[PDB]
Amino acid sequence: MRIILLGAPGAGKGTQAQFIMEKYGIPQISTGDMLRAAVKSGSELGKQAKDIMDAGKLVTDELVIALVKERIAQEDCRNGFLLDGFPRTIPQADAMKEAGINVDYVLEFDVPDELIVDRIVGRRVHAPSGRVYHVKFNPPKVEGKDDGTGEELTTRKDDQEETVRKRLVEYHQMTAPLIGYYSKEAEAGNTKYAKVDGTKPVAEVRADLEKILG
Numbered sequence: 001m002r003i004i005l006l007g008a009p010g011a012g013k014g015t016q017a018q019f020i021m022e023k024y025g026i027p028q029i030s031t032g033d034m035l036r037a038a039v040k041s042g043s044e045l046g047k048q049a050k051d052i053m054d055a056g057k058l059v060t061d062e063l064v065i066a067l068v069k070e071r072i073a074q075e076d077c078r079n080g081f082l083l084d085g086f087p088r089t090i091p092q093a094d095a096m097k098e099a100g101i102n103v104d105y106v107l108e109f110d111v112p113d114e115l116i117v118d119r120i121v122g123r124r125v126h127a128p129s130g131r132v133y134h135v136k137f138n139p140p141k142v143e144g145k146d147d148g149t150g151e152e153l154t155t156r157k158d159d160q161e162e163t164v165r166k167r168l169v170e171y172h173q174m175t176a177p178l179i180g181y182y183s184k185e186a187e188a189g190n191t192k193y194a195k196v197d198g199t200k201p202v203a204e205v206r207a208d209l210e211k212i213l214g
């Protein structure tokens with residue numbers, strides 16, 4: 001099956017992606033992880049994102065579409081995948097449609113703007129796997145360590161307050177309209193749409209999603 005996760009910065013998409021992946025056995029396609037990885041390794045496809053991400057702005061549709069195409073062509077996506085942080089704009093959604101990439105579920109994670117900044121300062125990550133934690137809301141089993149590899153967790157270069165605020169603006173400008181776009185898609189019978197309350201505890205959000213996805 002094919003799923004799109006939608007919602008504001010910090011809404012909880014990546015956290016639940018992990019559960020959907022390890023549960024329904026489809027790969028997580030995370031544009032944020034992919035772009036960070038490209039920057040880290042200096043890969044020709046995506047190293048360009050470095051400064052853009054630092055400024056809290058969106059990377060060009062052109063760049064991210066290329067990355068997803070390349071990722072989605074891999075054997076492990078043949079029977080479905082989870083798009084997490086993509087599409088991010090209408091043109092990104094349109095490209096998918098032009099390329100014949102329909103999806104079965106669009107899942108919207110609703111969180112009030114006012115919870116976003118506070119929430120994200122607690123965020124810690126394991127960049128090699130893309131796993132994410134929160135020091136209060138979803139701590140690692142061992143303080144400061146990734147559960148799976150025991151490596152020291154880091155803080156994302158773009159998780160600073162000022163940068164989160166810029167991302168939230170860009171989100172409302174460019175990304176928020178995908179709610180209407182995919183709702184219309186659902187009204188046309190092209191996919192299923194569901195909104196979840198992303199203010200509930202992680203386990204409860206996981207439970208709600210299970211109800212939706214079966």
Ligand SMILES: Nc1ncnc2c1ncn2[C@@H]1O[C@H](COP(=O)(O)OP(=O)(O)OP(=O)(O)OP(=O)(O)OP(=O)(O)OC[C@H]2O[C@@H](n3cnc4c(N)ncnc43)[C@H](O)[C@@H]2O)[C@@H](O)[C@H]1O
Nearest residue numbers: 009010011012013014015031032059085088123133134137
């Ligand atoms: N398609 C695209 N086009 C153009 N540019 C692109 C692009 N994709 C990426 N980019 C670029 O990359 C930069 C960052 O993009 P990206 O990394 O994709 O997203 P973000 O806006 O930076 O923040 P997230 O979307 O990763 O948050 P989330 O909804 O996954 O929530 P999370 O599960 O982490 O949780 C947040 C925190 O809270 C915790 N938490 C999770 N759920 C809950 C809960 N229910 N209650 C309490 N805490 C919770 C977590 O543990 C964590 O600490 C962009 O600004 C841009 O430059």
